[PDB]
RNA sequence: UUGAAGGCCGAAGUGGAGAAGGGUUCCAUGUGAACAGCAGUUGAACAUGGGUCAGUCGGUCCUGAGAGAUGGGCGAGCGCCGUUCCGAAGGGACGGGCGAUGGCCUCCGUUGCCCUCAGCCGAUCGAAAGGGAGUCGGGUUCAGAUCCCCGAAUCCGGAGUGGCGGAGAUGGGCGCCGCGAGGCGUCCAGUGCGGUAACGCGACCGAUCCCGGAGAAGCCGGCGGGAGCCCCGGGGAGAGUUCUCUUUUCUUUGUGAAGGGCAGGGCGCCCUGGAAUGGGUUCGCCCCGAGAGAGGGGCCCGUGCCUUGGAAAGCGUCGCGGUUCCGGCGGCGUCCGGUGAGCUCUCGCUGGCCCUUGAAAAUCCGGGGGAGAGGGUGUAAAUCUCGCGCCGGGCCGUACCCAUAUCCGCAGCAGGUCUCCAAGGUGAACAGCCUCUGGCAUGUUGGAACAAUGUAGGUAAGGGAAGUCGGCAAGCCGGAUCCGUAACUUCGGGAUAAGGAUUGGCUCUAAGGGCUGGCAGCCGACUUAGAACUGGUGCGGACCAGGGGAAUCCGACUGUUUAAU
RNA sequence: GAGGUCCGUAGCGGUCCUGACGUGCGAAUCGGUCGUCCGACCUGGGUAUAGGGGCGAAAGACUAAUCGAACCAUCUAGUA
């Protein structure tokens, strides 16, 4: 597994060919965003509400989106 | 209970002559004793040495003196510094008297044979 | 307490047969099989009895995986001889080659003076 | 393991090819590591050098002696012991050698022989204090210790 | 302080193997038990590592000695008549 | 069989799991003819059906002690010796040349021939405990799980067109145009950079050949670090007791592999500098003009902590449903600290012992060399141990028992049979004795009585070896602390010689240390010594636990020996 | 903190009671008491040595419950 401190390389990630679907953890003070690559399980850590909610919107739209609880 | 007795043996109880079936070596070993105690005691020197309360070739010295066991406790070797220290000072005040009275009368030898030249 | 077993067919505390304990996500304690621990590469001068430096030291079969960086150095003779033996190989073969250039022009000038 | 005298690894550079080769002496004594040791006919004469017996002097102290040429060393290799050239005989080219067993041989003069005694002189000085040394001196060398009457 | 009158090394043998066996061994035990002078670096780690193989702790050099002792009188003298017969050969 | 009660095993187990061996004994359903030395509604019995899933556990591969062909020799002969010895013992290869072929005949590949290069130590077998890359967590069955499902990884092999990206690698000079920014033409360089250094950065060309490392190692002692377990102080959640007391007693209170970072360890690694008034330093040592103390760095390990994984899962509790058929739905919680000559495991340093020096090989890597190759300034080329992407990993084993009932002994036989894990108290202790987790039903039967004789335990007045071949047997002594200790002697021993005193409970006193800022504050952990009181003189209260002395004979001693007199 | 060092667990062995049993639990076991317990130590697996031979810290000991010459078949219905 690894860790994406950025959010544009996340954003490249994502739109890379091999991203099968991404799947978004709300937990208290944190939000976080899991794309399953090839190899690699990526995730990108955000504690901003609204920036969480502004990447949710800007995430590819062809990719399967999955919000867990 | 078991519990209530360990707080009982701590108070000292049940710990006489007659409940005890090892050796004194067996119960608390004489050479943990004495690394324990070369431990405080190179330790209560190299703060000493490092705080500069004595130098180097004195710390040497009972350095050597506690290895070779003539300090039992950690008190009893800092009342030695604290004696060893005293007579320190009060040798080294006494030689700093004699050699400025000394120093004193050299300068005015000399301070006087130039005078002496100058008249002559 | 909780006491536990191998999990291999192997009940023997041969040298492949060294373990851990590690707890577990479940709340239970297990034996996790460790590898043996390697050792870096030991210099070539056959004199220093340390080893070498800036060399991972692994199990040797596992060298094909990492990359060249990693394991050498970048020096004359990196990776297969200590510095200080590489340096004093150095001025021995510069010092031996000027001393034979020295017997050598004695021997001409003793053959002109012949 | 099962011999007193230690053995020195040396290595020579091939002269036919880009090689190095290492070889095992039955190590002279006073010899050390990074010393250079001559090998052939016209080596000097020093400790630790091996050159044909027909060459040295008369009272010569000699390790490893070659019983044959070619032989590569058979006499006098135990810790401690050595032979010694008594006497030269250039024609049929002979030369007299006292072993270590005090007899006397005539040997070619064109085999080699290492020069000083072998190392570790002195062995069976220490008396073994009991059978269990005895047992560990004989377990390395074979099944014949414990000898019965 | 001292501990032993006679016996010194062989004190580990207890009463064992006789009074003589343990006195000849005794001057043994502590010539292979001293520590050396390295004749090349001047430091005393000569330790006798195997029989016959005495090592330097700061040179790492090994040389091939006695059994029990660094060197032999055997050996000094063989050297010493090496060298002459060898000054004599060259003249 | 279920429930309750009373007991035992007592963590070197009557517990949980494997190897050899067994071979279906494993699981379910049914039966009670035979068997399980009584009986049976039960069974390892009988009858029906079920049950063992692998690139990442082992075999397969390597070689060891050894075994074993061919050449050769011997042999009436089946055959034997022999393992490098009396062999023309190689069928491989970079490259160059020739000849053909396919694919857009480009360039390569298949080849066929020639030139050139080429030691193997001998075919082959030999370890399910040695060597040997790479898989872990949760859930799931009646019986299978590192094998199934879910989720996270990882190794090896392959890949014309390399599938992409990044590196190579993209600069300088001169001359024009342009106010400049910038652009056009000529030339020339370009198989990577940084640090004084130890070394570092994500790559960072290179063949036959040579050199080295890892694989690759004894036993014992001491010390240090890291875990797991145990212990202590408090928060929760749930249970026990509550005649009186107890802010009480008990249970439980997670985070893998693989990456990143940081502690914490180790350095016989580097730089400045130059030390006697010798210094540094350990439990011990040990170190220094061949460069110490002091400053500043570098590298290795990193099983510990945080983090991605990760809370979604697990667990504990409370509550709703499905009256069910539920990986159902929900709430809540999964906390904060301290200690230790503690026990086990592991990593590291250092020392001792040897007339003992404590494996090989498969395999992988680094270095030295420089035969060669790539492109002429670009849309760059050869080449990449860099980051992702694509495909594949065959064959065999896998159930269960493992031992007072699944093995050998004719048997459910007090015998024998190789290992791993290991709680609380007492205590020097893995001793003995009691308990918790887990297990069990007293060992191929029960009931009523308590004669003799037995077997195994005990106790006896007075005497104390008078017994008997013979103190056989039993008995006396026993731990620890404080005194004290002879003859003799190979001066090491004898020696716990011999002989005495003390030992409970309770209440105190003194001494023995850290951290922070000759002082002050805050923290502690176990020990030793002394005193008062006190009990029907009783205290190593059970358990554990040396009788001693004076001589003679023999063998120096430790060791071994007639499995079954 | 040395020692083929002492007391003493596990292990290894087998003294004495000439105890138990002696148509046994058992074709060599059981109890108490014992010896040693860092070494000439104990032990699995692999491997070598085969019968007038092996191996033996030596008792004619062990060599599959068999040993002062194993076991199997045959000569053999051997001879008295
Ligand atoms: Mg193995
Ligand atoms: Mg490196
Ligand atoms: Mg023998
Ligand atoms: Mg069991
Ligand atoms: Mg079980
Ligand atoms: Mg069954
Ligand atoms: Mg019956
Ligand atoms: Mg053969
Ligand atoms: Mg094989
Ligand atoms: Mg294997
Ligand atoms: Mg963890
Ligand atoms: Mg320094
Ligand atoms: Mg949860
Ligand atoms: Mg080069
Ligand atoms: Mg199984
Ligand atoms: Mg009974
Ligand atoms: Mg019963
Ligand atoms: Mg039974
Ligand atoms: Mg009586
Ligand atoms: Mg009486
Ligand atoms: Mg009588
Ligand atoms: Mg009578
Ligand atoms: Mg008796
Ligand atoms: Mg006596
Ligand atoms: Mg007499
Ligand atoms: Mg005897
Ligand atoms: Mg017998
Ligand atoms: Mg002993
Ligand atoms: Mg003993
Ligand atoms: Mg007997
Ligand atoms: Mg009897
Ligand atoms: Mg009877
Ligand atoms: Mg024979
Ligand atoms: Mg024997
Ligand atoms: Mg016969
Ligand atoms: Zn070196
Ligand atoms: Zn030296």
């Given at each position: 597994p690894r860790k994406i401190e950025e959010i544009k390389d996340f954003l490249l990630t994502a739109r890379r060919?091999?991203?099968?679907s991404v799947k978004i953890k709300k937990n208290k003070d944190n939000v976080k965003f899991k794309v399953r690559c090839s190899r690699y399980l990526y995730t990108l850590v955000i504690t901003d509400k609204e920036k969480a909610e502004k990447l949710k919107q800007s995430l590819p739209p062809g990719l399967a989106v999955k919000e867990l609880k | 209970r078991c519990r209530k007795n360990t707080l009982a043996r701590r108070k000292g109880?049940?710990?006489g002559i007659g409940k005890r079936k090892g050796t004194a070596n067996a119960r608390m070993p004489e050479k943990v004793t004495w690394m324990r105690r070369m431990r405080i005691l190179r330790r209560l020197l190299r703060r000493y040495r490092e705080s500069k309360k004595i130098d180097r070739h004195m710390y040497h010295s009972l350095y050597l003196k506690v290895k070779g066991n003539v300090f039992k406790n950690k008190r009893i070797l800092m009342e030695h510094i604290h004696k060893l220290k005293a007579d320190k000072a009060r040798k080294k005040l006494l030689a700093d008297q004699a050699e400025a009275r000394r120093s004193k009368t050299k300068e005015a030898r000399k301070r006087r044979e130039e005078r002496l030249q100058a008249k002559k | 307490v909780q006491r536990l077993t191998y999990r291999r067919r192997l009940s023997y505390n041969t040298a492949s047969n060294k373990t851990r304990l590690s707890r577990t996500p479940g709340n239970r304690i297990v034996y996790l099989y460790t590898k043996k621990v390697g050792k870096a590469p030991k210099s070539?001068?056959?004199?220093?009895?340390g080893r070498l430096r800036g060399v991972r030291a692994v199990?040797?079969?596992?060298?094909?995986?990492?990359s060249k960086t990693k394991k050498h150095?970048?020096?004359?003779?990196g990776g297969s001889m200590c510095a200080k033996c590489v340096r004093d190989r150095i001025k021995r073969a510069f010092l031996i080659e000027e001393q034979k250039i020295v017997v050598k022009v004695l021997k001409a000038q003793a053959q002109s003076q012949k | 393991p099962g011999r007193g005298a230690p053995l020195a690894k040396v290595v020579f550079r091939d002269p036919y090819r880009f090689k190095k080769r290492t070889e095992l002496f039955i190590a002279a004594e006073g010899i050390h590591t990074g010393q250079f040791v001559y090998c052939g006919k016209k080596a000097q004469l020093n400790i630790g050098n091996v050159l044909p017996v027909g060459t040295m002097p008369e009272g010569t102290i000699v390790c490893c002696?070659?019983?044959?040429?070619?032989?590569?060393g058979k006499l006098?290799?135990?810790?401690?012991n050595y032979a010694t050239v008594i006497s030269h005989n250039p024609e049929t080219k002979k030369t007299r050698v006292k072993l270590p067993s005090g007899s006397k041989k005539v040997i070619s003069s064109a085999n080699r022989a290492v020069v000083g005694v072998v190392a570790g002189?002195?062995?069976?000085?220490?008396?073994?204090?009991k059978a269990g040394r005895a047992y560990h001196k004989y377990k390395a060398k074979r099944n014949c210790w414990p000898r019965v009457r | 302080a001292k501990r032993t009158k006679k016996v010194g090394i062989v004190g580990?043998?207890?009463?064992?193997?006789?009074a003589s066996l343990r006195k000849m061994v005794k001057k043994i035990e502590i010539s292979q038990h001293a520590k050396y002078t390295c004749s090349?670096?001047?430091?005393?780690?000569?330790?006798?590592?195997?029989?016959?193989i005495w090592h330097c702790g700061s040179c790492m050099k090994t040389v091939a000695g006695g059994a029990w002792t660094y060197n032999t009188t055997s050996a000094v003298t063989v050297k010493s008549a090496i060298r002459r017969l060898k000054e004599l050969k060259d003249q």
């Open positions: 060919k091999d991203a099968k | 109880r049940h710990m | 070539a001068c056959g004199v220093c009895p199990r040797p079969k596992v060298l094909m995986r990492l150095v970048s020096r004359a003779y | 002696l070659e019983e044959k040429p070619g032989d590569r006098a290799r135990a810790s401690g002189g002195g062995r069976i000085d220490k008396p073994i204090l | 580990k043998y207890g009463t064992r193997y006789g090349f670096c001047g430091k005393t780690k000569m330790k006798r590592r195997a029989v016959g």
